[PDB]
Design a protein around this ligand. Sequence first.
Ligand SMILES: COc1ccc(NC(=S)NCCCn2ccnc2)cc1OC
Ligand SMILES: [Co+2]
Length: 326
Amino acid sequence: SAWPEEKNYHQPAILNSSALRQIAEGTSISEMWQNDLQPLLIERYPGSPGSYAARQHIMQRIQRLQADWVLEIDTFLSQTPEGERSFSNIISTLNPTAKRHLVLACHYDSKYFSHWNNRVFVGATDSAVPCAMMLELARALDKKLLSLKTVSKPDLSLQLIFFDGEEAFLHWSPQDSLYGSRHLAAKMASTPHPPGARGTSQLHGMDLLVLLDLIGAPNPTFPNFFPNSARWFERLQAIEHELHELGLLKDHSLEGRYFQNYSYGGVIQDDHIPFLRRGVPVLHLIPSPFPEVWHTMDDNEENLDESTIDNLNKILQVFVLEYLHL
Ligand SMILES: COc1ccc(NC(=S)NCCCn2ccnc2)cc1OC
Ligand SMILES: [Co+2]
């Protein structure tokens, strides 16, 4: 029947005033920084020790939560400019046999750069911070996410994806970029879902691909990229305004706010692409412009904004709760 269309009608359970204060008190940026982020601030292009440590580190964090996460490693070989490589997409699902899933993702790999002044590229905003931010969300919402084990409702849950091999080895191109996402999107496209169904794939399963990238610079501006996601975008603007109005953000002005009503001139390439081209509805939370420090050794911890990321943690968590009705 018409479960693949439930997404098109799905509405949010908008939190009340005190629930917003409650969530706000929920997340801790000090914790995330130390425990979720710092370990990831290491060289971690595919096949590197970083890659494995990052992969271990992300799984370590998730495995220690109460909510019934189900980790899966999507390892595959592909050709690259540098020769055959192994890529390992990290998927993390609650209630995986549930038909529908809201999907947050980022990329955990970093871009490769040869050593300049003994400096190593650690891709802080790009996209370690999104990583940690997802991990914080997992933690900060663990109790509330737990009640999804309780099986009344819409048959919907949360999925995380930590894509590997987003970056290009050489120069960006169809063939040298999005290795993990190009691979997992194809795989999802052709895996029946739910098990033993006719016609429908796991891609019918993705209600919305929320893709975090290049977050951590101060005062980011996000365009509203896609018509078919626009209402969910407008929720983020709605959430942002509301938290500020409640003095639950720090270092925030409505002039220097985050989600802008304007759209985007060209077309940005990222992990969402092989999904969007297969008609996954996509909410692409990449800033325009990119950070100043983008793809430069200055993409480092000295150059993140504590309050910006923390603020974005609050905003994002509310969005997820509200989507899943928790
Ligand atoms: C620096 O300003 C920009 C440069 C290029 C683009 N366009 C595209 S298609 N970017 C693809 C990004 C891939 N990626 C994601 C993370 N690390 C790499 C836009 C920019 O500013 C809006
Ligand atoms: Co990059």
